[PDB]
Amino acid sequence: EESSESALSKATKWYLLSEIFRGLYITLEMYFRAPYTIYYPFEKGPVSPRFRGEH
Amino acid sequence: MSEVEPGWHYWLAYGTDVPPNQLKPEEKSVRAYPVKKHVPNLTYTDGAYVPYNTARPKCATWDPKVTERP
Numbered sequence: 001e002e003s004s005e006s007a008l009s010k011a012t013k014w015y016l017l018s019e020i021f022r023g024l025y026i027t028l029e030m031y032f033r034a035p036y037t038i039y040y041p042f043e044k045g046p047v048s049p050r051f052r053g054e055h
Numbered sequence: 056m057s058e059v060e061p062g063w064h065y066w067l068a069y070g071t072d073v074p075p076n077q078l079k080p081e082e083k084s085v086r087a088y089p090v091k092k093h094v095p096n097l098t099y100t101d102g103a104y105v106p107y108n109t110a111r112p113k114c115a116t117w118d119p120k121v122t123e124r125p
């Protein structure tokens with residue numbers, strides 16, 4: 001008896017998948033962003049002057 | 056990837072803003088020995104590097120020598 005959202009308000013979010021559909025939309029945002037992928041071996045990742053490699 | 060010459064190989068890795076063909080002579084490498092063509096990694100081919108021991112055996116055997124009874 002001490003819930004702010006009425007019974008109908010909670011049922012609509014529950015039955016209509018309010019958070020899942022929001023979760024889907026945010027994923028779809030990343031579909032229109034530039035991927036981080038680089039193309040090895042045609043490109044290399046950054047290196048630092050302190051890099052420890054071949055003796 | 057190993058075909059990339061070592062001088063440029065550092066430039067392709069975003070470690071330097073000065074390409075190796077734009078170096079000032081005070082910074083380059085000056086060698087007393089010839090610098091032949093670049094050679095990549097040679098695995099899976101008969102030119103593969105073979106390790107070996109650079110040191111002679113620590114014990115030297117005796118050379119057979121005979122002098123007869125006086």
Ligand SMILES: CCCCCCCCCCCC(=O)OC[C@H](COP(=O)(O)OCC[N+](C)(C)C)OC(=O)CCCCCCCCCCC
Pocket residue numbers: 014015016017020
């Ligand atoms: C008249 C209205 C008609 C509505 C018809 C549609 C109803 C659908 C189901 C609603 C109930 C529900 O999803 O329920 C959630 C159920 C059971 O939850 P529970 O055990 O009660 O726990 C909740 C307890 N609460 C009440 C305290 C919160 O589990 C789930 O998370 C199911 C996840 C389903 C994911 C499917 C993804 C598909 C995506 C499709 C588009 C890309």
